[PDB]
A paper describes a structure:
Bacterial HSS is mostly found in α-proteobacteria and in some β- and γ-proteobacteria, including pathogenic strains such as Legionella pneumophila, Brucella spp. and various P. aeruginosa strains, including PA7 and PA14. It catalyzes the conversion of two molecules of putrescine (PUT; 1,4-diaminobutane) into one molecule of sym-homospermidine [HSP; bis(4-aminobutyl)amine] as the main reaction along with several side reactions. The cofactor NAD+ is bound as a prosthetic group in the binding pocket with its nicotinamide ring being part of the active site.
To experimentally substantiate this interaction, the tryptophan residue was exchanged for residues with reduced aromatic character (W229F, W229Y and W229H), for both acidic (W229E) and basic (W229K) residues and for alanine (W229A). In conclusion, the decreased or abolished activity should be caused by the exchange of Trp229 and not by structural perturbation of the binding pocket. Consequently, the reduced activity of the variant is not caused by obstruction of the active site due to an inappropriately orientated phenyl ring. In the structure of the W229F variant, the side chain of the variant residue Phe229 sterically confines the active site to similar spatial dimensions as in wild-type BvHSS. Firstly, the Phe229 benzene moiety is shifted in relation to the Trp229 benzene moiety and therefore also in relation to the ‘center amino site’. Secondly, the phenyl ring (and similarly the phenol ring in the W229Y variant) exhibits less negative electrostatic potential and a smaller size of its π-electron system compared with the indole ring, resulting in a smaller cation–π interaction energy.
Residue numbers in the entry:
A (entry chain B), B (entry chain A): 3 to 477
The structure:
């Protein structure tokens, strides 16, 4: 008795059939009506081909490249009779170029990252700033300015970026209610931004702890993760990056801003997966997270910016990832950065290989009158296995978020290029929540200055515990 | 047919019966002749009591403290008929005070660390310099000056500090042959220092990689290690510390020296178990180690110091620990520092819980004509079980070193206060080698600049790859 949300009146082209594609395909088949032969999967991998053949879906074993993407995707997306849907869950392909092609041809589009064409991330002719997610996001914002309106294309609608934007909205509404502030839920961007300002939210961590454990010990010289290894390593080697709040009064010497764009970002001249921050989640309590760059770090800070009449920002929250991956990924990062190079092999943990654990993923709003508030999902691998096949808990949070964005795009098909912060957060969470396990809000009195200073001198700001000065792990 | 080296006619007083005591006692019973009833074990824990009772050995369930150690230990050391042997394998006791008591009463003494009385490691009034192993070692050096000669007391004779001092001497001999350096084998401290200078040894890593894996996944909120958790955490929270070589051109801003003493060391105003360094071992290849303070970092650099007539140091190698512990300890450190406090529970892995792996422990001599040379032990858990009971591979490298130090002290019982660098390294390795598994020398062309600079600017010294400026990892 699963709900069927909408009929798709055209081709469904899934680009990429890795961990997320494999988890999303069953949800698409479950929740949408369409003729079976309308759906086709594109992935160059032989392992992906064999899995698709076993599931009985059409499969085209090809890499989408800058050279072929028009000749390949335009016929597939315009096969008729009506509007198709491009579901982009790949690596090494330009989200912007495919998004623009889909829009030119009237097809809906969704992805989970602003990915560039193969060769971008390690091109030595690029300055660190050009490798930032801020710069990639600005290409999408410029595309929206150049062609406002038109067919809906949802950028960066996964678990994070994606779902966490909806959690921020629900958390802000919950904070206001827990303070006795009633009525008038925000409906415009400026109203959301002023709610965060008015409640005194200084910053937001994307506070995640993955406790999924494997049935085999970590193999030497193998990178192990619960989702894309190539994707995670690629983003881990990008500069550490954060949305930068107006309350901050210190940044590292190797921090830099941007000459252009929305104004909400800084980056550090060091890899994010080797940069630690002090953070907190309900199950982990105090923990280190890695400051891996993510689209929502910028987009959430941008969304919640209040400007004056002159257009200058007067309020903006800090926002960044504080990611504690599964234990085998922690070991994998230690191995990779300690050897100076990528391991010779890698593997993504299948649900059949996971003995227990959860993916605790939420937002940590701090600086307000109740200090810190964590809101998000505590989905376990055991619950995952009972409600959705072919994925672990990490994957289900992502694939259910793509499902939600697809429902929203089908229900709002003339909205133009949108981010997760632009969607109806209540409708999206209504679609996604059956796949999120426990969704809870927890207050804590912890701050980054708990237990500090210790036995060594430290550079801290005791008048403001949540300053980045105190969060960043430094010598 | 294990060799029985000597008969011990006096009391054998073992202070502490933890992981090392439990591995050393069977070796003492195997390799020395004596009546079992002259053994006495002192330990405050019930777990130790039951283990000692299971071996039918006399047990005293007491913590040795500053308030009771004289009245508790003097009768035991002087019970006769022969000369006593105090084997100190404890935590929370003063190595110096117990050592001086033993010498005062004509009893031999051996320990594996310069330990202070309980309370020192976390006294909030102590300046960081006073919490350094340099300072603790200076208390032993002063005792030797104040009372030269006399009954032999062996300070810091475990695997590291201890065995690695003998590896350094053998490695210097191997390097001299391979580099064509001619001359008689050195037989005095000055001649060893001169050999290291003449070979161009810029520095030495105590380069260790523990690959022992457990049969169960790491539990949350449990520190897991292959030896003393309390001792490892205590030394991990002391300042990072190293012997400081004359070739070094740079030290970090938070580095500090010493106004008095042998002059061979610096320390950093940060905990050593959260300080990473770039290093290398044969099985690990390039890896991160932690810069945990160790007595041998100072003692080896001091031993290999060449002075001019004025008394000023003209050559000294850098020397420090570069320790990659077992995977569960790596996770335990990330957990402990990430939370800001010790875990609620801890456990030491038993040989029955270890499924495979080795304790690769050696010395990496670098800066010479063949770049870098690693010499040491690759003892596996499988070999350990075949040759010695009640311990893992980490433990056996330590207990066999205590055995070797005991044999040397019996054959040299009036040598005064001595460090491992002062013992006859060939005789000690003759006793220890049956318990070390493969002992190999390996050259490598790896340097700390391999693959650098990369995607980001780095504060490196391209003129000399082995500078500490290139080894230390900045966060
Ligand atoms: N927003 C989020 O929450 C979130 C979470 C996880 C992953 N992601 C992103 O989703 C994407 C997929 O993650 P994943 O775990 O499935 O990764 P994955 O590595 O498992 O799978 C990637 C797939 O892309 C395919 N591929 C490679 N080059 C291709 C090309 N040129 N054309 C088509 N396909 C190609 C590969 O064969 C592979 O099957 C990644 O880009 C990742 O960054 C987003
Ligand atoms: N040099 C080396 O290679 C090396 C290697 C490992 C350990 N060590 C050192 O050896 C020592 C023993 O290590 P371990 O692994 O056996 O430690 P452990 O923690 O396993 O055991 C310590 C024992 O000391 C006992 N103890 C505590 N307080 C005491 C007191 N006041 N008097 C007497 N006993 C007391 C405890 O009850 C326990 O049984 C530690 O100090 C450690 O730092 C040296």
């Amino acid at each position: 008795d699963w709900p069927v949300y909408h009929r798709i009146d055209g081709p469904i082209v899934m680009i990429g059939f890795g961990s997320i594609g494999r988890g999303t395909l069953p949800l698409i088949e479950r929740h949408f009506a369409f003729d079976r032969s309308k759906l086709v999967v594109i992935d160059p991998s032989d392992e992906a081909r064999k899995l698709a053949e076993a599931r009985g879906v059409r499969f085209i074993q090809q890499a989408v490249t800058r050279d072929n993407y028009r000749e390949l995707l335009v016929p597939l997306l315009t096969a008729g009779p009506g509007q198709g849907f491009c579901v982009n869950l790949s690596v090494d392909t330009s989200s912007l170029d495919i998004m623009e092609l889909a829009r030119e041809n009237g097809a809906l589009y969704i992805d989970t990252v602003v990915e560039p064409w193969l060769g971008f991330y390690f091109d030595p002719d690029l300055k660190p700033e050009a490798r930032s997610n801020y710069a990639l996001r600005e290409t999408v914002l410029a595309a929206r300015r150049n062609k406002p309106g038109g067919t809906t294309a949802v950028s960066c609608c996964g678990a994070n970026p994606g779902m966490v934007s909806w959690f921020v909205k629900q958390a802000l509404v919950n904070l206001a209610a827990d303070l006795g502030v009633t009525g008038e839920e925000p409906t415009t961007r400026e109203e959301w931004a002023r709610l965060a300002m008015d409640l005194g939210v200084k910053g937001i961590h994307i506070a995640e702890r993955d406790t999924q454990r494997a049935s085999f010990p970590k193999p030497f010289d193998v990178f192990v993760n619960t989702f894309s290894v190539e994707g995670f390593v690629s983003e881990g080697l990008q500069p550490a990056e954060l949305g930068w709040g107006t309350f901050e009064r210190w940044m590292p010497d190797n921090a830099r801003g941007h000459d252009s764009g929305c104004g909400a970002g800084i980056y550090l001249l060091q890899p994010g997966a080797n940069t630690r921050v002090r953070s907190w989640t309900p199950t982990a309590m105090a923990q280190y997270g890695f400051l891996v760059t993510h689209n929502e770090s910028i987009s959430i800070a941008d969304f919640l910016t209040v400007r004056d009449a002159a257009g200058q920002a007067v309020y903006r929250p800090t926002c960044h990832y504080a990611y504690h991956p599964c234990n085998d990924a922690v070991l994998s990062l230690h191995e990779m950065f300690g050897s100076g190079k990528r391991q010779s092999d890698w593997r993504i943990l299948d649900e059949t290989e996971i003995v227990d654990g959860i993916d605790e993923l939420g937002v940590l709003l701090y600086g307000h009158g109740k200090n810190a508030y964590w809101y998000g999902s505590q989905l376990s691998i055991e619950e995952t296995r009972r409600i959705a096949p072919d994925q672990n808990a990490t994957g289900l949070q992502v694939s259910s978020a793509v499902l939600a964005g697809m429902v929203w795009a089908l229900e709002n098909p003339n909205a133009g290029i949108v981010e997760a912060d632009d969607l109806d957060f209540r409708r999206c969470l209504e679609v996604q929540t059956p796949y999120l396990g426990p969704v809870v809000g927890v207050y804590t009195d912890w701050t980054p200055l708990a237990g500090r200073p210790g036995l060594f001198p430290e550079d801290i700001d005791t008048s403001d515990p949540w300053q980045f000065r105190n969060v960043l792990v430094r010598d």
